[PDB]
Amino acid sequence: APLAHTHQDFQPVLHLVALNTPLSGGMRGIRGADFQCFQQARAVGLSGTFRAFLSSRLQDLYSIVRRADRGSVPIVNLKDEVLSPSWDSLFSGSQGQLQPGARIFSFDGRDVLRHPAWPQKSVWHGSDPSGRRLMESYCETWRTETTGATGQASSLLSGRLLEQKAASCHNSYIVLCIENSFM
Numbered sequence: 547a548p549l550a551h552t553h554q555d556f557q558p559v560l561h562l563v564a565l566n567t568p569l570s571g572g573m574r575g576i577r578g579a580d581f582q583c584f585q586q587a588r589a590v591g592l593s594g595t596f597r598a599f600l601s602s603r604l605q606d607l608y609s610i611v612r613r614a615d616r617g618s619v620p621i622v623n624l625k626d627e628v629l630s631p632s633w634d635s636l637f638s639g640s641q642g643q644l645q646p647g648a649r650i651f652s653f654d655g656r657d658v659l660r661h662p663a664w665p666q667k668s669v670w671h672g673s674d675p676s677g678r679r680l681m682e683s684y685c686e687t688w689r690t691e692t693t694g695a696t697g698q699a700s701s702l703l704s705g706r707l708l709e710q711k712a713a714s715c716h717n718s719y720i721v722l723c724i725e726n727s728f729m
């Protein structure tokens with residue numbers, strides 16, 4: 547079964563972990579995506595609060611992490627490898643540029659880029675490079691997988707989380723979960 551991640555606490559960090567399955571724009575709303583993050587996190591023994599890395603109605607992706615934890619707290623993957631020095635650095639205009647060589651793991655320990663369970667190496671986000679929501683491009687608040695509606699997404703092969711591609715909601719992409727505060 548999935549092995550648990552037991553974080554040796556030292557200094558505050560926030561984990562960025564991918565869901566175990568890709569999802570389409572029809573996620574049953576943000577409530578739907580957040581619940582899967584919460585469930586999969588607990589399954590590997592994490593105690594923090596995980597929320598989907600997505601913008602929603604009246605909610606900018608940028609304000610997902612608690613104010614106090616935004617400017618300094620390092621972002622690390624499941625294996626506690628650093629992806630970013632802080633939350634704010636992703637919204638610096640770098641388009642969420644990750645550390646060269648970095649890798650994103652699912653809650654169950656798989657490298658999303660290397661594993662075939664994720665056919666499409668793209669991440670949904672519904673936001674601009676500032677982390678502001680795109681009301682015209684977030685699959686109607688992640689409630690539809692119809693070909694006609696779009697959701698802003700990013701190619702992971704690029705190394706950046708916030709690239710600006712408007713993709714058809716009828717697509718199976720990677721969805722990330724971010725620990726919203728350190729405790």
Ligand SMILES: [Zn+2]
Nearest residue numbers: 547548549550
């Ligand atoms: Zn096992």
Ligand SMILES: [Zn+2]
Nearest residue numbers: 553554624626
């Ligand atoms: Zn850890």
